Amino acid sequence: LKDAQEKLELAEKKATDAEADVASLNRRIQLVEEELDRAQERLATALQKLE
Amino acid sequence: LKDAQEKLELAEKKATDAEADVASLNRRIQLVEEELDRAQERLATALQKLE
Amino acid sequence: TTALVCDNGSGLVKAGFAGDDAPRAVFPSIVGRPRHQGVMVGMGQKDSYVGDEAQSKRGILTLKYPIEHGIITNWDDMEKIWHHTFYNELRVAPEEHPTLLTEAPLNPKANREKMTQIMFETFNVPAMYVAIQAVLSLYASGRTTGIVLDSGDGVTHNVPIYEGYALPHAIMRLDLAGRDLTDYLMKILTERGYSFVTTAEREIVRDIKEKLCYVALDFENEMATAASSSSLEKSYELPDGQVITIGNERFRCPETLFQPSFIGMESAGIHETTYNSIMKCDIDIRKDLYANNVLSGGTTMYPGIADRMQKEITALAPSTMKIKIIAPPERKYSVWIGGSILASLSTFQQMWISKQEYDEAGPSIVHRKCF
Amino acid sequence: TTALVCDNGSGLVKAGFAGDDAPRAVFPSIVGRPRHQGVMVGMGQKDSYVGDEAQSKRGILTLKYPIEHGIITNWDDMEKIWHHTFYNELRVAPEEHPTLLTEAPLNPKANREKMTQIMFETFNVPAMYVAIQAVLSLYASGRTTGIVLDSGDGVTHNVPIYEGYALPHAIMRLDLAGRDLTD
Numbered sequence: 001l002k003d004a005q006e007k008l009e010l011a012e013k014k015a016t017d018a019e020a021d022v023a024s025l026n027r028r029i030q031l032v033e034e035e036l037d038r039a040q041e042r043l044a045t046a047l048q049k050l051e
Numbered sequence: 052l053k054d055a056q057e058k059l060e061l062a063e064k065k066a067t068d069a070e071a072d073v074a075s076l077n078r079r080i081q082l083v084e085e086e087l088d089r090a091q092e093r094l095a096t097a098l099q100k101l102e
Numbered sequence: 103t104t105a106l107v108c109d110n111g112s113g114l115v116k117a118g119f120a121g122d123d124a125p126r127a128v129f130p131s132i133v134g135r136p137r138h139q140g141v142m143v144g145m146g147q148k149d150s151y152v153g154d155e156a157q158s159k160r161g162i163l164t165l166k167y168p169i170e171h172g173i174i175t176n177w178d179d180m181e182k183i184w185h186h187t188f189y190n191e192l193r194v195a196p197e198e199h200p201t202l203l204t205e206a207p208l209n210p211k212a213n214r215e216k217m218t219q220i221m222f223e224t225f226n227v228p229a230m231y232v233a234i235q236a237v238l239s240l241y242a243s244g245r246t247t248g249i250v251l252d253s254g255d256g257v258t259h260n261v262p263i264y265e266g267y268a269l270p271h272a273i274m275r276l277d278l279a280g281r282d283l284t285d286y287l288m289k290i291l292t293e294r295g296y297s298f299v300t301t302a303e304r305e306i307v308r309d310i311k312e313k314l315c316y317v318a319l320d321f322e323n324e325m326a327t328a329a330s331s332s333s334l335e336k337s338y339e340l341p342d343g344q345v346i347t348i349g350n351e352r353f354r355c356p357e358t359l360f361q362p363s364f365i366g367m368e369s370a371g372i373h374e375t376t377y378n379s380i381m382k383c384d385i386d387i388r389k390d391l392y393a394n395n396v397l398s399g400g401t402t403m404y405p406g407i408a409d410r411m412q413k414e415i416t417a418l419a420p421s422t423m424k425i426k427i428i429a430p431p432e433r434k435y436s437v438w439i440g441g442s443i444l445a446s447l448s449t450f451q452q453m454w455i456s457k458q459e460y461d462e463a464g465p466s467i468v469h470r471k472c473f
Numbered sequence: 474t475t476a477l478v479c480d481n482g483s484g485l486v487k488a489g490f491a492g493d494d495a496p497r498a499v500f501p502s503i504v505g506r507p508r509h510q511g512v513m514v515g516m517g518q519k520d521s522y523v524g525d526e527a528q529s530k531r532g533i534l535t536l537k538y539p540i541e542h543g544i545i546t547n548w549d550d551m552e553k554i555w556h557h558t559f560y561n562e563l564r565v566a567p568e569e570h571p572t573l574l575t576e577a578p579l580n581p582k583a584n585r586e587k588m589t590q591i592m593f594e595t596f597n598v599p600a601m602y603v604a605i606q607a608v609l610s611l612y613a614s615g616r617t618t619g620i621v622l623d624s625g626d627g628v629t630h631n632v633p634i635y636e637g638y639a640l641p642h643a644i645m646r647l648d649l650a651g652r653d654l655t656d
């Protein structure tokens with residue numbers, strides 16, 4: 001159907017936009033993982049200085 | 052119709068795939084943000100101890 | 103047996119069996135009698151189309167919601183809606199299933215008592231229980247603390263909870279919600295020439311609001327940008343053609359949430375009633391409430407609200423606290439998912455209001471220990 | 474076996490096995506019932522959080538000290554505090570350990586008698602002994618003479634001692650202490 005055709009096209013475009021946000025969330029995940037590792041290391045050094 | 056049928060099915064599968072991806076990535080971003088914040092609280096504890 | 107987790111709401115009735123992920127049947131709660139005369143004989147014309155059937159014949163009906171602001175104003179229509187929900191959308195007789203309705207905070211008692219009396223006398227359920235719409239939305243997030251802002255379509259209420267102990271003195275209920283935003287959008291569309299008046303065209307304006315409107319991160323900058331460029335004007339095709347172009351009406355309709363002075367309401371926006379609700383709490387649980395602010399309800403689905411609200415609260419709150427806004431993708435059905443989880447618990451299985459208890463104390467049993 | 478050196482105090486309960494340098498578990502002596510209603514089901518909400526647990530959930534509790542000025546005003550809460558101290562902070566059953574409580578000078582007799590009756594009937598210790606809080610503080614300094622001013626949180630008392638012979642007619646007990654300074 002023509003309207004179902006437009007709807008399916010719009011939904012697939014919405015899927016692709018969700019995939020663009022999937023990319024952005026992947027970037028957030030990776031950078032925050034770097035942050036997690038850096039925090040582990042910095043906390044270790046801070047506790048050592050405390051000792 | 053058959054053309055519309057295939058279009059509809061493919062768009063629906065793509066939409067569901069994108070939704071699942073973005074949802075799981077949202078869960079991941081939640082987890083990594085939790086990592087960051089809890090590490091920050093450790094940082095504050097260490098700062099207080101050292102001072 | 104299984105429990106029926108119904109959720110009356112105001113605008114969309116969501117129902118389904120306990121223990122699933124999503125409601126089985128979701129349909130608008132409108133009952134519309136026909137208004138014209140009708141000349142074809144034997145067409146099988148009914149006297150009232152309810153639910154999703156009246157969203158297809160809305161061209162010749164006069165749709166009227168039976169729930170105005172949380173409270174129920176037309177009990178016969180609400181009974182009709184419930185009867186439809188049980189028999190045609192779920193096809194399970196209520197004689198063999200417990201029910202778990204939901205109710206907004208700070209609602210009139212008579213509404214709740216009449217609800218339980220109907221459920222026990224007309225539909226004759228085995229046992230029913232009424233729960234506050236915000237505790238369920240907190241269940242669904244898997245938390246146990248946090249302050250939940252459940253901006254539905256009828257009424258926006260903001261219930262803070264800590265460690266499972268609700269704070270009854272800090273509930274801030276505000277009556278601005280999706281319906282007032284629909285009316286305000288329908289009122290500002292007239293500035294371009296489009297006039298929607300009929301109660302059927304309110305549905306078209308609602309669709310425009312859902313598909314196009316978004317919440318601006320900064321209001322003045324957006325007002326200045328939309329007045330110079332034309333990168334915002336998005337067009338939309340009415341149910342008959344004649345596309346329309348929405349300019350700066352896009353972010354002015356949902357801005358009413360943060361400035362209720364637009365529709366003449368005195369109170370402060372949803373960005374400041376949350377901070378006030380927090381400040382009424384004790385001084386030692388404010389950090390946890392700051393960090394676990396939860397959004398729910400349909401109207402909180404505007405694209406870009408989870409950032410505007412965080413910016414506003416960060417402006418209001420002390421600079422040291424961390425402000426985090428939980429906005430799950432399944433926001434619309436959050437209350438119902440929480441209701442399913444609560445009904446599926448074993449510890450909760452003895453809190454239902456059993457029918458013999460109602461027979462002994464009357465409808466006023468709901469205010470008693472079985473809350 | 475080893476002896477349990479408990480020290481009720483008023484504000485911080487300090488306990489630990491005899492022969493060490495520092496108390497094993499130090500935690501405020503407060504018992505706080507929740508005061509709001511509570512809507513989450515199955516959260517596992519207890520009826521009274523004692524000790525250091527009620528200093529973390531204090532946002533929704535009503536903390537109340539069971540010891541006002543040296544004397545004990547609420548015996549059920551004090552029994553709860555002792556039970557917590559024995560079973561969760563030290564994890565040693567009292568059936569196999571002597572106890573050494575401490576008591577301020579010039580306190581009511583009934584307080585001390587009730588304390589010993591509880592320790593012998595409820596917890597069923599093998600043997601308990603009550604000592605004046607100032608003589609111990611003189612022990613710790615390694616002296617044998619001297620006048621000790623033990624300004625606790627409940628009550629400030631000033632016991633002079635010479636050559637091991639305490640002077641009972643020169644004890645000056647004053648009820649100003651840390652709690653009044655907080656107020």
Ligand SMILES: Nc1ncnc2c1ncn2[C@@H]1O[C@H](COP(=O)(O)OP(=O)(O)O)[C@@H](O)[C@H]1O
Pocket residue numbers: 110111112113114115253254255256280281284308311312313399400401403404434
């Ligand atoms: N995707 C969306 N974007 C913007 N607004 C929406 C969206 N979906 C629903 N709404 C608004 O929310 C309302 C539905 O809210 P809902 O949560 O169903 O209310 P209730 O609490 O009564 O169930 C609708 O009237 C509509 O105005």
Ligand SMILES: Nc1ncnc2c1ncn2[C@@H]1O[C@H](COP(=O)(O)OP(=O)(O)O)[C@@H](O)[C@H]1O
Pocket residue numbers: 481482483484485486624625626627651652655
């Ligand atoms: N570092 C400190 N500086 C000032 N006052 C303190 C300090 N530590 C404890 N206090 C005060 O002393 C009280 C604790 O006294 P404590 O010796 O534990 O009493 P008790 O004799 O009952 O054990 C606390 O209530 C607090 O008011």
Ligand SMILES: [Mg+2]
Pocket residue numbers: 111112235252254255399400437
């Ligand atoms: Mg709702």
Ligand SMILES: [Mg+2]
Pocket residue numbers: 482483606623625626
């Ligand atoms: Mg002392």
